[PDB]
Amino acid sequence: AAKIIDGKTIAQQVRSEVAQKVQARIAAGLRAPGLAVVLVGSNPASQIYVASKRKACEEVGFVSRSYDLPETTSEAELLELIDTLNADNTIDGILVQLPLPAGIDNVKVLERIHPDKDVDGFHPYNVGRLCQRAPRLRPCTPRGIVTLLERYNIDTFGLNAVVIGASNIVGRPMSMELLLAGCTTTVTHRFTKNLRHHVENADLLIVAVGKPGFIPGDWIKEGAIVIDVGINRLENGKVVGDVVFEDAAKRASYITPVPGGVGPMTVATLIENTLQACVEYHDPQDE
Amino acid sequence: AAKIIDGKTIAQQVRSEVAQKVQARIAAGLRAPGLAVVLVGSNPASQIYVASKRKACEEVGFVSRSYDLPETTSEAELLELIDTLNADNTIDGILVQLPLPAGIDNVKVLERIHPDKDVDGFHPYNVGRLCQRAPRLRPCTPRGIVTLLERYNIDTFGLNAVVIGASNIVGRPMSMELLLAGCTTTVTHRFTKNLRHHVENADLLIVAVGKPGFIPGDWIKEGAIVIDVGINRLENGKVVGDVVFEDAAKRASYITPVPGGVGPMTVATLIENTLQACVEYHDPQDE
């Protein structure tokens, strides 16, 4: 009888907290945090993403500096905008939505953003810092998952955790983030032999493969904590995770639902990091 | 009957290769790679380190730009030197020996070095790049270990590897480096519960705790590959690793001796990275 990890509610709480802190700032004569979202092209999926980020943002009281550019804009133009965005004291965060037009150097563009404005946590600088136990702006998804564990009073130290994934956006930073929490981390991927074995002993599971029902609830260790990051929209209209909820729910002790688990935490965390970049790096109120 | 991984010889080969490539350069009218070693203070251990690096360096044909500064030099002076070193086209690498005087911001100084000159692989930028499967200048020790596996024709893909350590200098980058090689990585540390269990299944072991005989050869999985990074100089004059060589040698298939295993690879790799920084980043001969 697994306990539900209401990511929807927790994210609501996190959004609420950032709101108060913004009200406090304005009431004291201080500017509000400013996020800049740069959407290039017209990918329908990107539209729903950029809109959901822009909504939470205006909901907490930030200043929105939205830029909807054409799919034609050159790399020199996209970089020029970023240089200008880095030099603006009103802007604390810069979020350049992906995918970006093919032909544009993806890394040259993303890395052009100053790390202190890198609210998504992509820049290799903030990534290295996370690895070297000295975190700055941390990757949204992994950080969101850590917050989840915190809000439910889960002792992470000494836990044997397995991360099925190993990606740049989730798996890899997930491991670094879990070590910083005192977990014995194990990262699996495609070359992994006998995946069932590693999952068998894991006290904390974190799935991120992007394949519906990929991990049978059969494999989950009785008492484990399941964190399903996958969101697979089946052709019959249903939305399921990388794990078989029904079975896994019986074995597990805590589990994230899909949707309403990890998803709403990724956006909450972005908001959170924007606040952090303002309060600590761009306009801090020192003692 | 374990096979010996002669790190002493392999390192000799690596040093030889960098030599040839430097001769080729000079013979074609091109400058040689230049390394700058900055030793501050008078720690006897640091002296033997900086001397061993300066020797290999002159042995391969690099230009030595040594700086032996007093333990009194200020942080503003140490930074001033680095800015100047970054702007010198003759210098491809900058190695600021540690420990540095207490009172000097260790990170502010090390990070002041341009990543393209960071031949040790410390800067969070080169670390992030390693994590994001897009490596630039890689950390010396972990990279040296990968070279060891290569030179002995060891198939790393699909191997179950355990890294006993989790440090900024070895453990953490070791994991990132092993994933890039296709190993299912597991990183242990002090909070790890039942360490014997994880070691029991590991096909590739990598010990870095700094405690003599910490891992009994009893625990090693028959057929495993032992990589002992530890170098503990006992008070009786003897030098041993973190593993019990006698016992472990019987079980294992391949094993690194102490000394003459990993140690000589750390310096070989630094040399290698210096060459790489010259040939690719500072003075490349493009098509």
CATH number at residue B190: 3.40.50.720
Place of tokens 């200008």: A84
Are the beta carbons of B193 and A131 separated by less than 8 Å?
A: no
Q: Do residues B144 and B242 share a domain? A: yes
Q: Do residues A212 and A157 share a domain? A: yes
Last residue of a domain, one of B114, B149, B180: B114
Q: Do residues A43 and A104 share a domain? A: yes
User: Distance between CA atoms of A219 and A122, rounded to whole angstroms?
Assistant: 32
Resolution in angstroms comes to 2.6
Q: Do residues B75 and B180 share a domain? A: no
Classified as helix, coil or strand, B129 is helix
Chain B interface residues (partner A, CB cutoff 8 A): 107, 123-129, 131-134, 157-158, 160, 166, 168, 172-173, 175-176, 179, 182-189, 191-193, 197-198, 201
* Domain with A222 in it: 1-5+139-263
Q: Do residues B147 and B258 share a domain? A: yes
Asked if residue A133 is part of any domain, the answer here is no
Asked if residue A167 is part of any domain, the answer here is yes
Q: Do residues A34 and A95 share a domain? A: yes
Place of tokens 């009431």: A27
**B53 belongs to the catalytic site:** yes
Q: Do residues A196 and A252 share a domain? A: yes
Q: Do residues B145 and B258 share a domain? A: yes
Chain A hits for B128, Cβ within 8 Å: 123-129, 131
Last residue of a domain, one of B99, B114, B129: B114
Q: Do residues B245 and B158 share a domain? A: yes
User: Distance between CA atoms of A37 and A217, rounded to whole angstroms?
Assistant: 39
Q: Please identify which of the residues B6, B53, B116, B117 carries the catalytic annotation.
A: B53
| A145 in a labelled binding site | no
Burial label, B255 (beta-carbon count in 10 A; 0-12, 13-18, 19+) = buried
Last residue of a domain, one of A68, A99, A114: A114
Chain B hits for A123, Cβ within 8 Å: 128
Q: Specify the amino acid at residue B176.
A: M
Asked if residue A208 is part of any domain, the answer here is yes
DSSP annotation string for chain A:
-PEE--HHHHHHHHHHHHHHHHHHHHHTTPPPPEEEEEEES--HHHHHHHHHHHHHHHHHTPEE--EEE-TT--HHHHHHHHHHHHT-TT--EEEE-SS--TTS-HHHHHTTS-TTT-TT--SHHHHHHHHTT--SSPPHHHHHHHHHHHHTT---TT-EEEEE---TTTHHHHHHHHHTTT-EEEEE-SS-S-HHHHHHH-SEEEE-S--TT-B-TTTS-TT-EEEE---EE-TTS-EE-SB-HHHHHHH-SEE--SSSSSHHHHHHHHHHHHHHIIIIIIS----
For B170-186, b/e burial (b = at least 16 CB within 10 A) is bbbbbbbbbbbbbbbbb
Tokens of B158: 């699909």
Q: How many domains does chain A have?
A: 2
Q: The CATH number of the domain where A54 resides is what? A: 3.40.50.10860
Q: Do residues A103 and A160 share a domain? A: no
Asked if residue A243 lies in contact with residue A213, where contact means CB atoms within 8 angstroms, the answer is yes
